[PDB]
Amino acid sequence: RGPAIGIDLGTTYSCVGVFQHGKVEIIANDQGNRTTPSYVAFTDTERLIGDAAKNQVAMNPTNTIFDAKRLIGRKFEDATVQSDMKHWPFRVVSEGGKPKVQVEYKGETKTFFPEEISSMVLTKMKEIAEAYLGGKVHSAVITVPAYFNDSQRQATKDAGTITGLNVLRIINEPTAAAIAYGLDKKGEKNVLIFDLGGGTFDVSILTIEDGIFEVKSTAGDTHLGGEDFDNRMVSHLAEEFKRKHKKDIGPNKRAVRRLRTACERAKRTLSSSTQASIEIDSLYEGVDFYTSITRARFEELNADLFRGTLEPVEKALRDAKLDKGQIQEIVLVGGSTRIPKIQKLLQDFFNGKELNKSINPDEAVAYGAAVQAAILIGDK
């Protein structure tokens, strides 16, 4: 059954890891990136997957698919599908009651099931692993949200099957994060997983006893993440540009997009420095925009969004019939949990308790999946 491989198949980014020689290694892709966009693009001559797809998304938005994870295993008439469709730039249609994405490809209209799109992403993940390891990869553990039903889980396994992976197990994302931190080895333990990515927020409370995990509650917001925090910065800096150079970029989609790109990077910088520099040449009518933004102003622009993440924590606890003091371990998952203010708010809510954060939060799910793949093949 091959080398031990774990895959975090994410709504907008994916990550792959291997357990080798006693430890997990997260595998960088051919551009050196340790996470890979869950994006597939169709052009006049080819299908692009991963960074290559995401890199051309602004130039080919109606034929570049992402968020297939929000469709997989659902019916077309499902409320979440009909709501999500209103904000994607690509078309979603029905075939036998199932959703399919519709694109132009080589000058013709084609439709693809969500499991087909997701298989294309898994194939890229398999290739990334084979480049790193040599030889062929045979098996994988793939992760899903704890709230996924059996249809959703089976369609994810079908994506793997189409790729040519033996799917050893589909396990829950919060369970994978707990495994990564060895929390099953460290009596009953109540564990809270706080998973704030680019586009989704999931809080899960698990119990672990004698190596067995039970999900006790879930909560969150399916359309909250890093993109929302960036947009607050975009509005702010667009106003600054208008104040300083008397030009309104609002109506110009290229200029807004370029400012958003710059803001996304600045936000990353603000997780480890107290200021960040924006440097955009010819933003609008030949006018450059060079400026700086402090962590303090970033936190202030997002005050509601950051404090608001405690509400799903409170709700998960209520549904689990737990007091906050009965949580033994808190685990951070998702790139947005690097934000100092979000850590501080969570730590204070939990009366100063230290958070599990030593594994890159973008990687912890894949890490745990790779550990579980090892156990199942008998490589550990």
From Swiss-Prot:
ATP binds at residues 10-13, 69, 198-200, 264-271, 335-338. GO terms for cellular component: blood microparticle; CatSper complex; cell surface; cytoplasm; cytosol; extracellular exosome; male germ cell nucleus; meiotic spindle. The keyword Transcription does not apply. Its main location: cytoplasm. GO terms for biological process: chaperone cofactor-dependent protein refolding; male meiosis I; male meiotic nuclear division; negative regulation of inclusion body assembly; positive regulation of G2/M transition of mitotic cell cycle; protein refolding; response to cold; response to heat. Keywords: ATP-binding, Chaperone, Cytoplasm, Cytoskeleton, Differentiation, Methylation, Nucleotide-binding, Phosphoprotein, Spermatogenesis, Stress response. GO terms for molecular function: ATP binding; ATP hydrolysis activity; ATP-dependent protein folding chaperone; disordered domain specific binding; enzyme binding; glycolipid binding; heat shock protein binding; protein folding chaperone. The keyword DNA-binding does not apply. Residues 1-380 are annotated as: Nucleotide-binding domain (NBD). It is found in: Cytoplasm, Cytoskeleton, Spindle. Interacts with FKBP6. Interacts with ZNF541. Component of the CatSper complex. Interacts with RABL2/RABL2A; binds preferentially to GTP-bound RABL2. Interacts with SHCBP1L; this interaction may promote the recruitment of HSPA2 to the spindle. Belongs to the heat shock protein 70 family. The N-terminal nucleotide binding domain (NBD) (also known as the ATPase domain) is responsible for binding and hydrolyzing ATP. The C-terminal substrate-binding domain (SBD) (also known as peptide-binding domain) binds to the client/substrate proteins. The two domains are allosterically coupled so that, when ATP is bound to the NBD, the SBD binds relatively weakly to clients. When ADP is bound in the NBD, a conformational change enhances the affinity of the SBD for client proteins. This is Heat shock-related 70 kDa protein 2. The lineage of its organism: Eukaryota, Metazoa, Chordata, Craniata, Vertebrata.
